[PDB]
Amino acid sequence: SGIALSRLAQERKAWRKDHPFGFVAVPTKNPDGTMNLMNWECAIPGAAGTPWAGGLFKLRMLFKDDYPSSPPKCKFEPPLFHPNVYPSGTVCLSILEEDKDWRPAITIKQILLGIQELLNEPNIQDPAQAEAYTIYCQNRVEYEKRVRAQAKKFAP
Ligand SMILES: Oc1ccccc1-c1ccccc1O
Numbered sequence: 443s444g445i446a447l448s449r450l451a452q453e454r455k456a457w458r459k460d461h462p463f464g465f466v467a468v469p470t471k472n473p474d475g476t477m478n479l480m481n482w483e484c485a486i487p488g489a490a491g492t493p494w495a496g497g498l499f500k501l502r503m504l505f506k507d508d509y510p511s512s513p514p515k516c517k518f519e520p521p522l523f524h525p526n527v528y529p530s531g532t533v534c535l536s537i538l539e540e541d542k543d544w545r546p547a548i549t550i551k552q553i554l555l556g557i558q559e560l561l562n563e564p565n566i567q568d569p570a571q572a573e574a575y576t577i578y579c580q581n582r583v584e585y586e587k588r589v590r591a592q593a594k595k596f597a598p
Contacts, residue, residue, distance in 0.1 A: 443508065479505070497592065502519050503516050512544070513544040566578070
């Protein structure tokens, strides 16, 4: 897709020029070694001063041929404990749905910051995995304990 690839090159240039510290976002490679702009490997650092601090949380960002009409699918690999992350790893977030709050102008940087913000502030209206959601609702102290253990597990 010429339209998607042109925009993704634009995103890559912008990201490399200016991006938040500790974040990573890079396109992958095709089997022949060439760059594959439709599939990115990213990492989001936990915010300091939060239970996510010190963790580095890896995720894949997958673009459809009609991007930026459509949002990327964003999928934590491996899956994360969080009320709004499906067991598959896929992120449940309104800016990542075409029929909700996605806008074509939204940047990869805005997506990754949006997901970082989600990590530390779950949306109770969007339960995506039963366990983390139930614990978040029932016992915030236990919830944060599980989150800190997870951050340690994924320390760089
Ligand atoms: O290992 C990484 C280091 C830095 C940034 C991304 C990754 C990654 C993200 C998703 C899937 C695989 C990966 O290797």
